[PDB]
């Protein structure tokens, strides 16, 4: 039952969850010959891959957080502060 | 004759007492290392049991059979196996050796090593012979038997260094020391009341002068002489570990040299 | 089981001693001590090698 | 590029505490009513007895890697037997109306009361000391 | 077979202390005494005083005498044995006599800022050993993965790794559902 | 006027002893007869050793060659201890031993011997110490029931 | 029941053959099974 | 097991080479080697060595695990002067004085006797 | 399934989060990578090598599911790899995987480590990971386990692995930290007295892997260049750490070098040991790893370890049997000491005899005297040991080693060295197990020392029979005890974590159960997580009265009690100011209040508590970053500072809600960090304390604002079994008055008992 | 005892008092006589606190014997563990203890309701748990460039 962009009160920062959620999800298709969205700066390692990517804010997906009565914010990855 | 040198001040077969003087300890202790592992010698590295009734196990005894020290003084005319075009072994890569023995007598009867027939060809290199300075001219006891009990094998020997398994090595151990009196300080020495009354004199201090209890700590002193004395086990005589030794150095070092060139 | 060939420690050979080790004390009657000097096994980790040798040989060979 | 204090001091005191090689020499200005001196030497590399007396100056050359002698075979901006070379944590004690500067050797450490040369003393490390016979 | 001793294997003296070997160096490397014996064996001292072995250290040095001097050594308990009588005999044998000596290290000759202690010590090897011990369990046609090491992975927050390895390699089934009635009722 | 290196015992403050104890050192049991010094080690340790001892590998009997059991370890060179009690002559361990004299340093050198480990010595080793024998026996029978 | 140890039960089990010692240590073992 | 065979400690793997030669990025002149199948004995005697040249301004060695036979020698040298230079001026000292000394003991054994 | 056990041993060269695998273990287990044509050349090389040469690959399966055995296939020679295949390659260095050593009770027995492939046949570790696996190498195996997936790999790194658990929670301090050798070297390495010359010091710094390559210049020039030992350490210390230490009498010239004071990182003073480098709350491993971060602490365990072993490996260290033996007049005082105690027992005992001793009050007469008797005796024991301890010298290797911390006690050199004592089993002297005797070589009716149990002798000089006896009789009463620890103890961690496995962080911050029932409003009363906290001290709460007004008040309208215009630039024109003062008289009230807030929290009065954000640092960084004089009055405003921490405070953020309720909420949970606050950004202090400049003062809190919000607790987290694996691993290590202790209570705890053991009431 | 309370100039001094400790326990009796302060009375054991007191008294008392117990030992575990596990005991109001067929068939005659935020729950069912790294959905961003 969903929250709007105004009013969301959740943490504005990713946590170590999403993020290795993140990366890890971003990795598995980048290793599954994905194709890709940032500079090869020399990188093989889909991993690292993903972490440039996460870094350079060009990860297109949305973390939908739950809260625990039902109800969801829906946060992008360009969006969360990364600390 | 300029440089490192040295003053002998005993010999014998089998040591060789001396002292190096105008040296860094580095070249001192390689000296050393060297002296221990890496001087080629001969030594069984193979052994084929036909038979063995004794009450030893086969790898027992062919343990042992790698341990009797075998003559080695023509050892650079010896190829190592691995460089040697030979399928395996020949006479250029090897000594073969035979084992035969029956407890013939009823008390028991011991298999020493000059039981040891060589059966190959020597080219007229003296290698290969088992090493004897016992009274009897036993050599090593290598094993015993019962009447009834045979043991039969051959052995190959091989050069070999003892990095690659102390067997190889022609040295046994190896004194050294310097700068006994402390005078350094390279070491803090540990009692409970007295530092002197407590430690005892090493008999490298006669040959140097006491310190003098004014002359206060002097910062510029080296490593500069060393107290050595080698022992052999026989295989190779003694001046020969040594000079062997610092042979066996110059050529590592050269070997390095020779690869600069090929850079 | 057997003398040893070598001491662990030095690689001494002292495998070619125990004839006469076993000599030296029931023949000459010398105290373990001197005997193994006498040997000229001078420091401890060869004098242990001899001291502490047990000849169970012996023992093998008794069975048929 | 300089020279920063330097004047001669008595000393009251020599201390080994514990160690061997090294002791805490407290020593007075010759001159001066107010300027001490607390300080750790090596006493192995440069001994020093009760009463001796010292010529000592802070100094600040003659940051790059060190090289051993060579330039030090001519080039000695030393005509001194003893020189270290620390770094200044100083806490200006600034006590009374006197300065305390602390300076540390490697560890052997030092310390100078007085007042003059507050407008002198390195607010920092670069800076080394020499002492003569 | 002839098991040759290794890293891994386990080796003990007699109070109650044992340690696997970590790591093996040839004699040239060792530390060495002037007279260039060397050590079998090199343990920590670390071991010590907190196991208050006592017993380790006064065999050590009854050792050193009985080994110089050809006579068996009297370590029973409760008799007059004393350190200081053996440490007076280890004197008379020209050692100083709690038992150090100077040793150097071998890597460079120089000798060692403090000195070592040093002596034979009857130690055992006892059995069970690193290759017994080993095995390495990953399909083709302890050593688990708990209740306790679940909750571990779920202290830190992994719950991809949590399924795959619980999971079944049983196939993931597919299935169509009723919306309002959830039962597996749907024909499809 | 006692030896200031002895330990203190406090007197008979008795003239009434019916008997006298053979020897203290029967209190104790096979294998604690085996450690040297035990009264010189806090009390636990002395259980420890009492255990491994059971596992350390020497010369079980002198028959080996002859039995054929499940798995046996013989050492090649069994040395008999420089330190022993007297109980050992009664427990025949000199002559059936089960362990060897190493010549052992006690120091910091490397770093690899930490946290109860150790440094052994390869030429040694080379040369066979701690070196043994294991054997392993496989049964099977026959036919059965069918 | 000497093959068992059916009894009390463990009360026969096969003899220890590790060391000499241990051995001698079996044969001399007792057992309490089952208020300090 | 998985035990290396003993020779691996002396001699060359298919593919490696007894020299490897690189520049130092840290700092100029500078060079590290890593020597294969050599320890200590070699090592400590070139480094102690090219430490009696007075336009080495560093060097130093250490094997980094001991399990390998391999060790790593990192020279620096004033301007001008090739650090490989330095080596062989070094590796040079080493054969002489040795050279030298082989010659001074042969000597010393005939002035004998037993 | 994916995994292998083997013995473990220790490895100095090895980093703290690698782990050594042997080679035929890296054979062994597998790796599903799929070819990508980032990987397809590798891959194809790792193909041809196969199973049995390492690096290499045991199967590959297409497109199909096809599954192509290495070893046998006919054809695997000759493949071809396409894009899109899978190829399960042996792992090799660098993948992650977890290591676990058992049983696994808490999640740092469970960390991702780095595969490094090794020759012999056990898996290798670095000392200092140690600690928390509860790991030795006399034995001990370990588990490591391989993950499967890209997703699994990239849980492992970025949440498991070592460098992110040097900090837990379980604590809030370091779980790892120097050990052992590195630990009896460092401190031997950086003592006065130690100076290296150039040879070795150029071996050491050549030994650190990322010195710049510059030689720091030594602290001798003059007859020697010589080095000392504090400076090449210094090394491996990394720029920008700063940590400071007063020991019992300790100041900035510490005559006897202790405390530790290091700045920019080089030591400055004092030796270094276990409080600096040690797994200790506010040392150096928990500083960097703070400042700089997991990798780079990381890094740091292994540059010192390779400096200090080189170093110890060159020094040398032993121990002997001389080591344990005090001097002749010392054993002739505690032969004495001892027998003090020996008499003051006889006199309370014929005292007891003649019915002239007292109890008091319920206590028996008996009890009266055992409980006199075991003190006296005690007190010997104790004063013995002390005897031996002074007594020994400062080369006493023992004694080094307890110096040091890494290993030994007191009570270790005291019954090595003095005295054994009393032995005692439940907590009685032996008991009369024969008729009145404790042994048939007494005689009945015997008290004495002798008699029950005490022990004279020390371990040098060995035991009697019947102290022997009588020891092991406490003996064994130990080991008993512990198998009874160690069971009971295992069973409350099973339970308490089931219990608690549950609750959860959720992204409201509130703390729930798996039917969202609430359990706490907020986690931990703070919202913070717990490792991110350090022990600070409130300064408002100590102190006179006067005092804290002389720290904090300013006066502006008074020419004793204003900011003296040094302080300030703006000083001059400020004094007399109505309308600044009108806030600094707000600031005051406001500290004041806190104060009395805090000391009806603390009614103690204890200052130091565990808060987040450790702001002294932060000032001593900042004082550093921006080279602060002292000696020139401050660009600071009185309002850039006063309200500058105003501001701040609003955006010190745990909740984030809309509504009143949250906000009540957000403004108590921030309550306690921002008294801290307050006190430590204070008109007075900024000025006359800290100095700082505009830039600084505003580099501070933005410092102070970031490390908040990281500090503040992630949802998601399993706070439940966090919560009760720390409590309980560390029951587990209660291997050891009068009313009932330790795990047996712990169990009448947890268990709710009606019928408790020691049942008390204390009355004021 | 010892006992740090602040001085009369403001701070905090040692002032020695008497205090009674006792074998048994009677808090609702004892907390009645003359002459004690009742604000300040204490026991260790919690039940008791929880049946005078309440329930937050029983709570906090249940804390402070937990946390004995871990200091006693020398060791240091932060607070919120053992607030959480304290908290845990009393939410329900009371002192809450911490310490298959047959059951489904109870599921159903109860109509249990398995909120499956497990676990062993989810991987029954092949899926991730919602714990940690699985607490909130991933989706693919339609939303972006
Ligand atoms: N820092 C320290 C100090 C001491 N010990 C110990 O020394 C005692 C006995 O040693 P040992 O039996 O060898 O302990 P473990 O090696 O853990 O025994 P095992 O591996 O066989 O279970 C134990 O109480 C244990 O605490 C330890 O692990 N770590
Ligand atoms: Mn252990
Ligand atoms: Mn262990
Ligand atoms: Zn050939
Ligand atoms: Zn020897």
């Not at chain 9, 290798?124 to 140690?130: A, D, E, P, Q």
């Not at chain 9, 010359?197 to 510059?214: A, R």
């Not at chain 10, 062993?120 to 939303?143: C, H, K, R, W």
Request: proline letters at 4%; glycine letters at 6%; hydrophobic letters at 40%.
């Amino acid at each position: 039952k969903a929250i709007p962009k105004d009013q969301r009160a959740t943490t504005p920062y990713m946590t170590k969850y999403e993020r290795a959620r993140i990366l890890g999800t971003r990795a598995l298709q980048i290793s599954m010959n994905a194709p890709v969205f940032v500079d090869l700066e020399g990188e093989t390692d889909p991993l690292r891959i993903a972490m440039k990517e996460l870094a350079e804010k060009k990860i297109p997906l949305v973390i939908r957080r739950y809260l625990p009565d039902g109800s969801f914010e829906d946060w992008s990855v360009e969006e969360l502060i990364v600390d | 004759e300029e440089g490192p040198q040295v003053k002998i001040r005993e010999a014998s077969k089998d040591n060789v007492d001396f002292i190096l003087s105008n040296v860094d300890l580095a070249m001192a202790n390689s000296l050393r290392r060297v002296m221990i592992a890496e001087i080629p010698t001969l030594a069984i590295d193979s052994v084929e049991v036909e038979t063995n009734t004794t009450v030893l196990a086969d790898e027992f005894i062919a343990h042992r059979l790698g341990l009797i020290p075998l003559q080695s003084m023509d050892i650079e005319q010896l190829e190592y196996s691995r460089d040697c075009f030979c399928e395996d072994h020949c006479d250029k890569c090897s000594v073969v050796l035979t084992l035969q023995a029956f407890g013939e007598s009823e008390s028991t009867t011991n298999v020493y090593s000059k039981d040891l027939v060589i059966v190959s060809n020597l080219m007229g290199r003296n290698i290969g012979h088992p090493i004897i300075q016992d009274k009897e001219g036993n050599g090593v006891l290598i094993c015993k038997l019962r009447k009834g009990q045979e043991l039969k094998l051959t052995c190959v020997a091989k050069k070999g260094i003892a990095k690659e398994h102390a067997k190889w090595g022609p040295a046994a151990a190896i004194e050294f020391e310097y700068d006994p009196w402390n005078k350094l300080k390279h070491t803090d020495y540990w009692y409970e009341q007295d530092s002197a009354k407590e430690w005892p004199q090493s008999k490298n201090c006669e040959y140097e002068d006491p310190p003098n209890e004014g002359d206060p700590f002097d910062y510029k002193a080296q490593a500069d002489t060393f107290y050595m004395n080698v022992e052999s086990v026989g295989s190779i005589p003694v001046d020969q570990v040594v000079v062997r030794g610092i042979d066996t150095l110059q050529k590592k070092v050269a070997s390095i040299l020779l690869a600069l060139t090929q850079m | 089981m057997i003398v040893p060939v070598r001491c662990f420690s030095c690689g001494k050979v002292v495998g070619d001693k125990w004839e006469s080790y076993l000599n030296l004390l029931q023949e000459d009657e010398l105290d373990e001590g001197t005997a193994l000097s006498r040997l000229g096994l001078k420091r401890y980790c060869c004098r242990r090698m001899i001291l502490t040798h047990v000849d169970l040989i012996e023992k093998f060979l008794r069975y048929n | 590029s300089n020279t920063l204090f330097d004047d001669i001091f008595q000393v009251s005191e020599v201390d080994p505490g514990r160690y061997n090689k090294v002791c805490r020499i407290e020593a007075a200005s010759t001159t001066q009513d107010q300027c001490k001196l607390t300080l750790d030497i090596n006493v192995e590399l440069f001994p020093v007895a009760a009463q001796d007396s010292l010529t000592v100056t802070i100094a600040s050359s003659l940051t790059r890697s060190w090289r051993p002698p060579q330039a030090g075979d001519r080039s000695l901006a030393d005509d001194y037997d003893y020189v270290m070379y620390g770094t200044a944590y100083k806490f200006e004690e600034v006590s009374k109306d006197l300065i305390a500067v602390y300076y540390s050797f490697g560890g052997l450490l030092m310390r100078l009361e007085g007042n003059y040369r507050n407008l002198n003393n390195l607010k920092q490390e670069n800076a080394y000391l020499l002492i003569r016979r | 077979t002839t098991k040759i001793p290794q890293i891994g294997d386990k080796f003990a003296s007699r109070h109650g202390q044992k340690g696997t070997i970590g790591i093996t160096y040839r004699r040239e490397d060792m530390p060495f005494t002037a007279e260039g014996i060397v050590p079998d064996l090199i343990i920590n001292p670390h071991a010590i005083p907190s196991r208050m072995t006592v017993a380790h250290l006064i065999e050590c040095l009854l050792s050193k005498v009985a080994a110089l001097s050809g006579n068996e050594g009297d370590a029973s308990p409760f008799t007059d044995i004393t350190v200081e009588g053996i440490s007076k005999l280890l004197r008379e044998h020209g050692y100083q006599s709690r038992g150090f000596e100077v040793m150097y290290n071998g890597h460079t000759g120089k000798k060692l800022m403090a000195q070592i202690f040093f002596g034979p010590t009857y130690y055992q090897r006892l059995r069970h050993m690193v290759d017994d011990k080993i095995h390495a369990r990953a399909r083709g046609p302890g050593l688990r993965f708990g209740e306790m090491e679940r909750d571990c992975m779920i202290a830190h927050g992994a719950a991809s790794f949590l399924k795959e390895r619980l999971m079944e390699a049983s196939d993931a089934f597919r299935v169509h559902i009723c919306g309002i009635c959830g039962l597996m009722t749907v024909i499809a | 006027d006692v030896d200031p290196a002895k330990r203190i015992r406090v007197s008979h403050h008795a003239t009434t002893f019916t008997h006298c104890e053979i020897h203290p050192s029967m209190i104790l049991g096979v294998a604690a007869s085996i450690i040297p010094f035990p009264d010189h080690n806090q009390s636990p340790r002395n259980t420890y050793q009492s255990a491994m001892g059971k596992q350390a590998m020497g010369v079980f009997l002198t028959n080996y060659n002859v039995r054929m059991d499940t798995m046996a370890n013989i050492l090649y060179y069994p040395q008999k201890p420089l330190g022993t009690t007297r109980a050992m002559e009664y427990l025949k361990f000199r002559e059936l031993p089960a362990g060897q004299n190493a010549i052992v340093a006690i120091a910091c050198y490397s770093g690899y011997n930490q946290e109860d480990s150790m440094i052994m010595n390869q030429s040694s080793i080379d040369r066979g110490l701690f070196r043994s024998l294991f054997f392993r026996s496989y049964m099977d029978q026959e036919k059965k029931y069918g | 029941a000497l093959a068992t140890g059916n009894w009390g039960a463990g009360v026969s089990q096969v003899l220890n053959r590790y060391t000499y010692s241990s051995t001698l240590s079996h044969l001399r073992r007792t057992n309490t099974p089952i208020a300090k | 097991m998985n035990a290396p065979d003993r020779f691996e400690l002396f001699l060359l793997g298919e593919g490696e080479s007894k020299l490897k030669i690189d520049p130092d990025t840290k700092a100029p002149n500078a060079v590290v080697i890593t020597f294969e199948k050599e320890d200590h004995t070699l090592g400590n005697l070139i480094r102690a060595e090219l430490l009696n040249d007075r336009k080495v301004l560093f060097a130093a060695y250490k094997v980094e695990h001991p399990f390998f036979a391999r060790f790593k020698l990192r020279i620096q040298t004033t301007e001008g002067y090739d650090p490989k230079d330095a080596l062989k001026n070094a590796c040079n000292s080493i054969i002489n004085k040795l050279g030298a000394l082989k010659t001074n003991f042969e000597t010393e054994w005939n002035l004998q006797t037993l | 399934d994916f995994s292998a056990r083997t013995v473990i041993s220790g490895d100095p060269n090895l980093e703290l989060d690698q782990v050594g695998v042997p080679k035929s273990i890296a054979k062994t287990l597998t790796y599903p990578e799929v070819v990508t044509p980032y990987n397809i050349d590798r891959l194809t090389q790792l193909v041809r090598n196969g199973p049995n040469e390492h690096p290499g690959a045991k199967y590959v399966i297409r497109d199909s599911g096809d599954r192509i055995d290495l070893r046998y296939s006919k054809r695997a020679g000759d493949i071809q790899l396409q894009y899109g295949w899978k190829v399960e390659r042996h792992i090799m260095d660098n993948d992650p995987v977890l290591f676990n050593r058992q049983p696994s009770l808490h999640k740092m027995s469970m960390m991702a480590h780095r595969v490094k492939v090794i020759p012999y046949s056990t898996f290798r570790l670095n000392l200092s990971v140690t600690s928390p696996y509860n790991a030795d190498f006399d034995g001990d195996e370990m588990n490591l386990h391989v993950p499967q997936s890209e997703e699994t790999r990239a849980e492992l790194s970025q949440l498991c692995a070592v460098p992110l658990q040097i900090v837990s929670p379980q604590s809030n301090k370091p779980c790892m930290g120097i050990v052992q050798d590195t630990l009896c070297g460092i401190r031997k390495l950086t003592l006065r007295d130690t100076f290296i010359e150039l040879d070795q010091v150029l071996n050491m710094l050549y030994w650190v892997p990322d010195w710049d390559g510059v030689i720091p210049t030594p602290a001798i020039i003059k007859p020697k260049p010589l080095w000392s030992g504090k400076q090449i350490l210094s090394v491996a210390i990394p720029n920008g750490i700063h940590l400071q230490r007063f020991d019992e009498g300790t100041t900035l010239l510490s005559p006897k070098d202790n405390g530790m004071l290091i700045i920019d990182g080089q030591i400055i003073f004092g030796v270094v040991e276990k409080k600096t480098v040690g797994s200790s709350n506010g040392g150096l491993i928990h500083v960097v790893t703070r400042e700089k971060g997991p990798q780079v602490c990381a890094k740091l365990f292994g540059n010192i370890q390779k400096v200090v072993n080189f170093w110890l490996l060159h020094n040398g260290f032993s121990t002997g049997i001389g080591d344990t033996i005090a001097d002749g007049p010392t054993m002739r005082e505690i032969t004495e000491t001892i027998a003090e105690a020996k008499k003051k027992v006889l006199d309370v005992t014929k005292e007891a005899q003649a019915n002239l001793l007292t109890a008091k009050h319920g206590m028996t007469l008996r009890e009266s005297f055992e409980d006199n008797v075991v003190r006296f005796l005690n007190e010997a024991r104790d004063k013995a040991g002390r005897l031996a301890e002074v007594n020994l010298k400062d080369l006493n290797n023992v004694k080094q080693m307890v110096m040091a911390g890494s290993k030994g006690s007191f009570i270790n050199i005291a019954q090595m060295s003095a005295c054994v004592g009393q032995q005692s089993v439940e907590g009685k002297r032996i008991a009369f197990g024969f008729v009145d005797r404790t042994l048939p070589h007494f005689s009945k009716d015997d008290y004495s020392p002798e008699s029950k149990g005490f022990v004279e002798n020390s371990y040098l000089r060995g035991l009697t029979p019947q102290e022997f006896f009588f020891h092991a009789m406490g003996g064994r009463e130990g080991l008993i005890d512990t198998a009874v620890k160690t069971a009971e103890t295992g069973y409350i961690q099973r339970r308490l974590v089931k219990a608690l496995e549950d609750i959860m962080v959720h992204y409201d911050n509130t703390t729930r159960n798996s039917l969202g029932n609430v359990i706490q409003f907020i986690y931990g009363e703070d919202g913070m997580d717990a490792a991110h906290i350090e022990k600070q001290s409130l300064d408002t709460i100590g102190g006179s009265d006067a005092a804290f007004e002389k720290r904090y008040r300013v006066d502006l309208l008074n020419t004793d009690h204003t900011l003296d215009p040094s302080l300030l630039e703006s000083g001059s024109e400020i004094l007399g100011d109505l309308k600044l003062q009108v806030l600094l008289d707000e600031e005051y009230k406001q500290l004041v209040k806190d104060r009395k807030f805090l000391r009806e929290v603390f009614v103690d009065g204890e200052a130091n508590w565990p808060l987040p954000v450790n702001i002294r640092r932060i000032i001593q960084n900042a004082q550093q970053t921006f080279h602060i004089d002292h000696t020139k009055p401050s660009d600071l405003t009185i309002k850039d500072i006063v309200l500058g921490v105003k501001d701040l405070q609003e955006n010190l953020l745990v909740l984030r809600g809309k509504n009143e309720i949250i906000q009540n909420a957000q403004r108590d949970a921030v309550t306690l960090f921002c008294c801290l606050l307050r006190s430590r950004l204070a008109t007075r202090r900024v000025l006359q304390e800290y100095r700082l400049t505009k830039q600084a003062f505003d580099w501070v809190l933005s410092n102070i604002e970031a490390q908040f919000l990281r500090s503040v607790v992630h949802p998601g987290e399993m706070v439940g079994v966090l919560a009760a694996q720390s409590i309980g691993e560390p029951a587990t290590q209660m291997t050891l008055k009068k009313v009932t202790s330790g795990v047996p209570r712990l169990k009448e705890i947890l268990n709710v008992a009606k019928n408790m053991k020691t049942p008390s009431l204390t009355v004021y | 005892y010892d006992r740090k309370v602040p001085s009369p100039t403001g701070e905090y001094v040692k002032e020695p008092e008497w205090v009674l400790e006792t074998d048994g326990v009677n808090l609702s009796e004892v907390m009645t006589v003359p002459g004690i302060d009742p604000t300040r009375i204490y026991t260790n054991s919690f039940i008791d606190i929880m049946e005078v007191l309440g329930i937050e008294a029983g709570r906090a008392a249940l804390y402070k014997e937990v946390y004995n117990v871990i200091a006693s030992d020398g060791s240091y575990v932060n607070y919120r563990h053992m607030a959480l596990l304290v908290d845990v005991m009393t939410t329900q109001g009371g002192l809450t203890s911490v310490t298959t067929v047959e059951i489904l068939f109870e599921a159903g005659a109860s109509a249990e309701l398995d909120d499956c935020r497990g676990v062993s729950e989810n991987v029954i069912l092949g899926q991730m748990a919602p714990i940690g790294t699985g607490a909130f959905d991933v989706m693919i961003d339609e939303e972006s460039l």
